[PDB]
């Protein structure tokens, strides 16, 4: 082994606590998009940490694109400050990470059909529909996308340890189904 998964995307939610006028928000923000007809939220962005926020009239906000939990909270506080600077009585509350995505490379090809047959109740593999095997782990409850190349995607985690836990649990199985 020796491989440890790399975090790729962190999704979080934040309650600003006050109602927002989206045209005002979009108008005053330096990096905003807002087309009511397409989606009901201002799509705001900041350069550091590089992230994207979906800002709603209710004052709720979704922050995505961060590569670390630190970066997620940091960028979230920053978006909240922007809203304040524009003039609303916003508050940075209820910061919570909802989804963590990770990925790695085991460095060997995998026999997906064998794995799907062996771990049938957790696996779903339809190569004509999507080339990767969808593995639904029980403990921890994580979803893994397994590819012939040996590249692995882990998602559905609320905490970093779950990403790490799942990979540790899957590695022996990937080894059992290697090609070379």
């Amino acid at each position: 082994s020796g491989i440890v998964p790399t975090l790729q995307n962190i999704v979080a939610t934040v309650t600003l606590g006050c109602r927002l006028d989206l045209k005002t928000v979009a108008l005053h923000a330096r990096n905003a998009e807002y087309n009511p007809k397409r989606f009901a939220a201002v799509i705001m962005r900041i350069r550091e940490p590089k992230t994207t926020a979906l800002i709603f009239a209710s004052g709720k906000m979704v922050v995505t694109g961060a590569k670390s939990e630190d970066d997620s909270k940091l960028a979230s506080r920053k978006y909240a400050r922007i809203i304040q600077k524009i003039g609303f009585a916003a508050k940075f509350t209820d910061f919570k990470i909802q989804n963590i995505v990770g990925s790695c490379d085991v460095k060997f090809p995998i026999r997906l059909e064998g794995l799907a047959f062996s771990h049938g109740t957790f696996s779903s593999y339809e190569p004509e529909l999507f080339p990767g095997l969808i593995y639904r782990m029980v403990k921890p409850k994580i979803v893994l996308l397994i590819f012939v190349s040996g590249k692995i995607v882990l998602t559905g985690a609320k905490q970093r340890e779950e990403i790490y836990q799942a990979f540790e649990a899957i590695y022996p199985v990937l080894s059992e189904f290697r090609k070379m």
Binding site: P109, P127, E128
Partner: peptide, 10 residues
């Protein structure tokens, strides 16, 4: 042979 890594069977 596994010559075609992930191409659709069709």
């Amino acid at each position: 042979i596994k010559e075609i890594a992930g191409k659709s069977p069709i």
